[PDB]
Design a protein around this ligand. Sequence first.
Ligand SMILES: Cn1c2c(c3ccc(Cl)c(Cl)c31)CCNC2=O
Length: 310
Amino acid sequence: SGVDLGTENLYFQSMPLQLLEVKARGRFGCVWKAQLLNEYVAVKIFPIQDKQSWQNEYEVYSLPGMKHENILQFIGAEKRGTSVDVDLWLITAFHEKGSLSDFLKANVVSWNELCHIAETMARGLAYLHEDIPGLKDGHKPAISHRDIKSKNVLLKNNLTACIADFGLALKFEAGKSAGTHGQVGTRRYMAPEVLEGAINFQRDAFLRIDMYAMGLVLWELASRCTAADGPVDEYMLPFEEEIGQHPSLEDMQEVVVHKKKRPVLRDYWQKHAGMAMLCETIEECWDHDAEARLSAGCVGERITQMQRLT
Ligand SMILES: Cn1c2c(c3ccc(Cl)c(Cl)c31)CCNC2=O
């Protein structure tokens, strides 16, 4: 996998590397499609002012157990150049289909494709969320992502989803509370309690915040799904219909908190038994009541259930 034009190359671990083109813009850096030896890889390049996000992501990837089919594969990380011109790189697998966001813009999904992407995404988030003692490399902590959105879910060639971008991720050692405000993520996906600015610095509070955002990603999937053979409109961001592409904090507060509104679950989706069950699941994920939200693992099983629905 890779063309061979014969020009100047760089090295990574003594292996030829070349940058191809910018593929995406992360929150903290630029994602390049690149060629390393004979494979395509993604080189995420962080400016020096985002050194802490580079460090955070490297640290997260260095935690016990952080290798999984539904977590974007880490290849390496390196502080390069000089202390006056610092190059901060993090290299991962590259996936040609890119983000679920880009995919859904250009493509629709059948019922069974939606189920595959949904289940795999859910399993990746559940694994990220899971506290896992007894690994050969140590004790994996529960990890909150803190910016779950369709831009941060990548699709492999057969539409298997994986979770990407751990620049904001925060691990939790235990279940005890520690006192916070937490508007670090993407505004349109922020849960009501986040938009109000008043949250519990506790593991479950942070996991429930991710689960609200994942409910919105599942709505995105439903919005572009051909199940039951109805009309499918052009891809829209969650809340774009209600408050546009660049909402203020105030707009989000009005729609999400005061009006308790969510993206529309279309009436004709209730006629397909699988979609109806998806709709129920999404509703539990985005509940105003954080304690009412489903866990990532629960969602995994709902999807398996609905995929096997009869
Ligand atoms: C590794 N990666 C990231 C993004 C990507 C988009 C497309 C592809 Cl192919 C890859 Cl590998 C991406 C978006 C923001 N953050 C990432 O960490």
